[PDB]
Structures are given as structure tokens and as C-alpha cells.
Design a protein around this ligand. Structure first.
Ligand SMILES: C[N+](C)(CCOP(=O)(O)O)CC(=O)c1ccc(-c2ccc([C@@]3(O)C[N+](C)(C)CCO3)cc2)cc1
Ligand SMILES: C[N+](C)(CCOP(=O)(O)O)CC(=O)c1ccc(-c2ccc([C@@]3(O)C[N+](C)(C)CCO3)cc2)cc1
Ligand SMILES: Nc1ncnc2c1ncn2[C@@H]1O[C@H](COP(=O)(O)OP(=O)(O)O)[C@@H](O)[C@H]1O
Ligand SMILES: Nc1ncnc2c1ncn2[C@@H]1O[C@H](COP(=O)(O)OP(=O)(O)O)[C@@H](O)[C@H]1O
Ligand SMILES: [Mg+2]
Ligand SMILES: [Mg+2]
Lengths: 336, 336
């Protein structure tokens, strides 16, 4: 649309500057990749200074405090080379670095060399000191909030038993909390959504970059790792309803888990002098830690998915997905 | 107050973490330095990780968008070692690094070695790419806004001629705009308030750090330099009403101006191959540039001061100060 093009043009000229000042409106069109759009400097123009030639316009399409935290977080991760560079912030959105790349696919997560690189990157992320609350209320605080939001949803006319009741989730949350309370896991700065779609394979390699910090917070290490392992099971590119596919046998084997964990710990502990024996203990303990915190991935996203279903119709089977996550929760809990 | 102490304690524990978790309430008291407070970790406690032992709590005591920009800016300057580190952001304020230091005094600005260091630091600041509007509307946009705000002030009962009328400021703004429009000055990321009080002399030296980014924006280089030169004249520590003192003969001489400019340009142009002749031209041009943009410092702060006067009584002579700035404006304009 004319208006959308004009706004993008203005934002690029104003926030990027440099060569962008020389761009004529007729030479720039936005490309959707929807709230996300690519903008590229015309080939004929040389860059002036360090201003980027390739950006993504992200439109917000959220509380004040929330927006402050989100923007500060993005800005800091950019400075630390853990996210895309930040070129403009304005009321409607932001301008970010377009990272030349493609996202990983579900099946690629299991490849040993990529898996090692993901583990290293996650550990790097977990090394960050960020100016946010360090108290680990995010996990159960968010789940408790989601549960309350679900309880408060207006009835829709759908006749099925409420998933909260079918799976006894209010009670089960207490059961999960008790299990996890018995399971030490250090509190670190977590991504919280390290799925394939958020892992960019760089065309100009440090071979990967994480994106999508919507859910990031100080949280239990075990959640970030366990959540990533859960993602090995789900492909969100499936072309028929419900528009995801679960392959439970694709959950990582013990050997695949340990491979990841060894590389994670190599990065996390790189500044430390540890014996082979101490290292093995750290690995074994982390295996157990993750086996329990992985359950929280199912619980968390199942609750989140019920809420998504309340805002959805036929574009994705959110309720179906929720039920998949809760089924796997009880299966894997039973397998501990 | 009990409540203030409790909040500070909670914020420190929650946002700083580490050793702060071990602090008992009875061991921590805030020290005013008022919206700014020092918090120090008890001596007996060892640090756990990289969490700071010495912080400043800054209470806000402002629009959403404004707060986003302010916080992003602070966070970025911290990452780039151009401002204090940022340890917490929350609705009420922030936690910052306490920089072991003291502020400069007015008279110290003229010392050649310090002046050279200030010039270098200002040029460093001007090297920053920041995710904010690059269009230079800040100067006249802000002054136009201030003028409109002054026009809209409720009458108070004070009988004196309005300074806008006494100094024909609406007309004069157009005169200034025309002069500056004829005066090239590159648009860079400016501090906009490089007064002595905002220049910290480090106790653990890079010998200085700037603080107070309230006014920072993309703006004309000439304003930042000229404003700094104006500050050589004013001491805001004067102990009798109006609680500032002006010493007009303390404005930098041509030689003092050129000393500063040489050091500024040495930093600004460090990546460039310039002949002695080209360098001298850059210096001479900058001298003229600054001589004109310095006038905008008087105008800007005079307008700002009228607004401050509307919220003040006996704590500082804002209207008196405004009149000082406007008098010097017309004097220095006449001397061009
Ligand atoms: C577990 N997970 C990490 C939760 C957080 O998701 P995000 O990372 O915020 O996406 C992923 C997840 O639950 C998820 C991921 C993707 C999708 C999704 C994928 C595709 C579509 C779709 O493009 C499918 N469609 C093309 C057939 C119609 C338009 O909508 C809609 C939704 C739905 C759910
Ligand atoms: C030109 N300037 C850079 C404008 C921006 O000021 P800020 O950097 O935001 O302070 C500085 C300026 O105009 C200014 C700077 C300081 C003061 C000021 C200094 C001291 C006080 C004072 O502490 C004086 N008092 C102790 C006698 C009573 C309480 O208020 C009040 C105001 C007033 C004005
Ligand atoms: N900075 C970037 N450069 C290139 N591609 C990106 C960038 N950020 C996100 N993407 C891609 O765009 C898609 C959505 O971006 P993301 O930040 O994950 O938003 P969301 O998942 O909430 O829509 C992802 O597939 C991701 O691979
Ligand atoms: N991070 C810091 N560490 C130590 N002192 C500081 C720090 N920030 C500000 N100060 C000092 O506190 C005073 C006020 O801080 P500043 O940021 O300039 O706020 P404002 O001038 O708006 O009150 C200044 O005198 C400055 O020297
Ligand atoms: Mg994403
Ligand atoms: Mg200050």
C-alpha cells in the first residue's frame, strides 16, 4: 500500500541516514517476510558511512514497561553480537539488521555438528548479564498467569471439555513445581524459544545467530535446554491441518542429549579448571536436570497454546497442539 | 524512610543478584547524592560473580516513547564505554554503575590538558551511531516547542515584561536560524550538555567519563562544542542568590578555542589521511562554525530557563539566568 511504502521510505531515510538520503521513493519497495519487511538500498548507490544497506522493518502492530525492557534487551544483545543490530526505534516498530541467512529446519537440529554449535551458542547466551530481574519467577509466574487468563476466557460455544479439566492442570502445576523444586538448575539469562525457526544459519560466518527474544528472561537453565530438545519433535511447516507435525521418536536419545550437554558445558565452564571426573558429574547432573525441566516446556507451551486458540480459527490447530504437548508431558513424566 | 530503604534493598537484591542476595536489610542504607542514591555492598561480603559492589539508584520521580529512547540510549552508551553501566531497569527508575570519580569544576575546564581530554571525549561521543532520528530537528524543534510552551504559561502575577518580548525572541529565532542555515555543521550524536558537572574525573583511569544524557540527540556538531565553550563562563555552585555566577572573560580565547578544536579533530579525523593544509582548513572552518553555533547555546538554555522559572521559587534564579544568557547572546552576536 502507498501509505505503508511511504512510511517505510521515511523511516529508512530518517533512521538509517547516509546513502538512504539519496534514495528516491520509486526505487524502494518493502518485501514481506505479516509484520516484518525487507528494505534494501538500491544497488547503484554507494554506502556513505557504516549505515546498513539491508534492514528489516519490524512493525509492532504492549505496556510501557514491557516495551522498555524489550527494546533495551534487543539493543544490548546487538552490542554483544548475540542478536541483530538495531538501527531505529520509533513508536510503530524498529529497524533491524537483515541477517543474510536462512532458518534451520526441524530435522537439522539432530545433526551433530549443528547441535554442538547450537549448544555453544545457547551457553553464550546464558553467559549474559542483563539489567533485568534475576529472580526466577518467569516460569511458574507466567504459567500461573496463563492459567488465570484461560480461566477468565469468555465461553465460545465449543462444547469440548476444557483442557485444564481434562488434564487436571491446576493440580498438575503443583506436582510439576514440587518436582522442579527438588531439581537444582542455575538461573541464567534464557532465550526461552530456541526452536529451529529462531536459529539462523549465516551465509557470512560463529556460524549461527539466534533471533526472537519475545520470551527471553532470567530462568532455569534446564528449561532452555529441555525446551530445545522438545523442539526436535515438532515441525511447524507441515502443510495440512493442524499445520504442525509431531514425531515423538525424534526426541534426542541419551547419546544425542549428552553430545549437546558436553558442548554446552565446554562453553559454559570454559574459564574453569575441572577434572575429567568433575566434568562427568556436571554432565550427568545436567542430563537429569534437563529430563525434568523439559517437562516444563510441554506444560508452558500447552498453556500458551490454549490462549492462542482463543484468538484463532483455521490457520493453525492450537488446541490440537496443546493436547499434543500435554499428552507428551504425561508420557515423559511417566518415563522418569 | 523505611519504605524507601526497603524498596532500595529489594531492587538491589533482585536486579544485582550475586552477593546482594546475602545482604541483610540492617546492613544497607541509601545515601543521597534528590533522586539519586548510592548503594554499597557490605565490606564483609565477597562478590559472587561480575555483579557490581557500588551502584547508583536513580529514581525517575514522561511518555512511553521517550522512556524507551532514554533507556535504549543509556544501555548502548554503557556497552560502548561512553556512560555508566546499566544494572537494572524498572518502572520507578534504574540502577547504574557508581563511577568512582568527582565532577569537574568550572575553572578546571580551561586547563589545557583537561580541555584536550574533554575534546577527545566529545569527539568519541560524536562518533556514535545510535538508533535514533538522524534528521537535525532537535535544535530548532526544541526551541520552537519551548517558545510555544512559554507562550502558553498561565499568568502568575509577576509584573515584569515577558522575556520573549523584551528580547524579541520569536523574531530573533528566525534571525538565528538564517545565520545557522548559512553555516555548515555536520549532524552527529551530541551530548548537548557538556558542562563541568557532567564530566567525571575518574579515580581509576581514558581519564574522564560523561554522564547525563537527558538532552542527547543527533544535532549540529557546532552546538555541542559551542555549548561547552559557553559553560566556561558559568558556575552553578555559587553560594548566594541567584546561585550561579557568570564570568564573561572566562569564555575561551581564540587560542584556547583552537587548542580544543585541534584535539577534537585529531580524534574525529583519526582514520583519515590529511595534509597539514587540509587540517588547518578544518580547524579554521570549525572555529567559525562554533562561533555561530555557540549563540544557539545561549538561546536554547535561555528559553529552557524561562520554563524552569515557572516551576521554581527561591532555589535558583532561573529568570535571572535566562536574561544573562540572552544578554550574552546579543553581545556575542554583535561581535561576529
Ligand atoms: C512452541 N512454540 C515455540 C511456541 C512459540 O511460538 P513462536 O516462536 O512465538 O512462533 C512454537 C509454536 O507453538 C508455533 C509455531 C508456529 C505456528 C504457526 C505456523 C504456521 C502458521 C500459518 O502460517 C499456517 N498457514 C500457512 C497454513 C496459515 C497461516 O498460519 C501459523 C502458526 C504455530 C505455533
Ligand atoms: C545551562 N545548564 C546546563 C542547563 C541544563 O542544566 P542541567 O544539566 O539539566 O542541570 C545548566 C543550568 O542552567 C543550571 C544548572 C544548575 C542549577 C542549579 C544549581 C543548584 C541549585 C540548588 O542546589 C541551589 N541551592 C542549593 C541554593 C538550593 C537548591 O537548588 C539549583 C539549580 C540551575 C541551572
Ligand atoms: N534480523 C533478521 N534477519 C533475517 N531474518 C530474520 C531476522 N529476524 C527474524 N528473521 C526471520 O523472520 C522470521 C520471524 O522472525 P522472528 O524474530 O522469529 O519473529 P516471530 O517468530 O515472532 O514472527 C523467522 O523465520 C526468522 O528466521
Ligand atoms: N554514574 C555515576 N557515578 C557517579 N556519579 C554520578 C553518576 N551519574 C551522575 N553522577 C553525579 O551525580 C550528579 C547528578 O547526576 P546527573 O546524571 O548529571 O543528573 P542531573 O544533573 O540531571 O541531576 C552529578 O554531579 C554527577 O557528577
Ligand atoms: Mg520466531
Ligand atoms: Mg547533570
Amino acid at each position: 500500500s502507498r501509505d505503508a511504502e511511504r512510511r517505510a521510505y521515511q523511516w529508512c531515510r530518517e533512521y538509517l541516514g547516509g546513502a538512504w538520503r539519496r534514495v528516491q521513493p520509486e526505487e524502494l519497495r518493502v518485501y514481506p517476510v505479516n509484520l516484518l519487511f525487507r528494505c534494501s538500498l538500491p544497488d547503484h548507490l554507494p554506502s556513505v558511512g557504516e549505515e546498513p544497506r539491508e534492514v528489516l522493518l519490524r512493525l509492532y502492530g504492549q505496556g510501557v514497561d514491557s516495551l522498555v525492557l524489550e527494546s533495551v534487551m534487543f539493543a544490548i544483545l546487538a552490542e554483544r553480537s548475540l542478536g541483530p543490530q538495531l538501527y531505529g526505534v520509533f513508536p510503530e516498530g524498529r529497524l533491524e539488521q537483515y541477517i543474510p541467512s536462512r532458518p534451520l529446519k526441524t530435522q537439522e537440529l539432530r545433526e551433530p555438528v549443528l547441535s554442538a554449535a547450537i549448544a555453544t551458542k545457547m551457553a553464550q547466551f546464558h553467559g549474559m548479564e542483563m539489567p533485568f530481574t534475576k529472580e526466577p519467577h518467569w516460569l511458574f509466574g507466567t504459567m500461573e498467569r496463563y492459567l488465570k487468563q484461560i480461566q477468565d476466557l469468555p465461553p465460545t460455544g465449543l462444547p469440548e471439555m476444557n483442557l485444564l479439566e481434562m488434564y487436571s492442570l491446576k493440580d498438575e502445576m503443583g506436582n510439576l513445581r514440587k518436582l522442579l523444586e527438588s531439581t537444582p538448575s542455575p538461573v541464567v539469562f534464557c532465550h526461552n524459544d530456541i526452536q529451529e525457526g529462531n536459529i539462523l544459519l549465516l551465509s557470512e560466518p560463529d556460524s549461527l545467530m539466534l533471533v526472537d527474544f519475545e520470551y527471553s528472561s532470567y530462568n532455569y537453565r534446564g528449561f532452555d535446554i529441555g525446551n530445545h530438545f522438545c523442539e526436535w519433535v515438532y515441525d511447524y511447516t507441515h502443510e495440512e491441518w493442524p499445520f504442525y507435525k509431531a514425531r515423538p521418536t525424534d526426541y534426542p536419545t541419551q547419546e544425542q542429549q549428552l553430545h549437546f550437554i558436553r558442548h554446552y558445558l565446554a562453553e559454559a565452564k570454559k574459564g574453569e579448571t575441572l577434572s575429567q571426573e568433575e566434568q562427568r558429574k556436571l554432565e550427568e547432573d545436567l542430563l537429569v536436570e534437563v529430563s525434568r525441566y523439559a517437562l516444563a516446556s510441554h506444560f508452558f507451551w500447552g498453556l500458551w497454546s490454549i490462549l492462542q486458540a482463543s484468538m484463532s480459527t483455521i490457520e493453525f490447530g492450537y488446541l490440537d497442539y496443546a493436547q499434543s504437548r500435554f499428552q507428551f508431558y504425561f508420557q515423559q513424566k511417566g518415563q522418569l
